[PDB]
Amino acid sequence: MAKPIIPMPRSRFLRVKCIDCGNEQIVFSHPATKVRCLICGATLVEPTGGKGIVKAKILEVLE
Template identity: 50%
Template sequence: MAGNFYNVQCPDCENEQVVFGKASTEVSCAVCGVTLATPTGGKAEFEGEVLDVVENRTVEAE
């Protein structure tokens, strides 16, 4: 996958939400509606604090 997911904390209500790093649309907080990420044509610009990078998970065939 070409991009990472980030755990972002809302600057207003402190809700933690996972956001795609190359978001193509504006991402709002699910709790209070504040903008968390704004698209820039490449990597999104985050308004809240980035707490962690969510690791890529691969599914192994059984």
């Protein structure tokens, strides 16, 4: 970990660009809960403990 000089998780951010409707979401890298589209209600990702399993094929740009 990173406990003595600034605590840091395992996480990061990535921008996902959907292909099921083209909505652009920023996603946290440890899904704990499913993510929905704001315009279709369709599933981007399904969660498995810690880092979720990425449902279908959806692009990701790693910020």
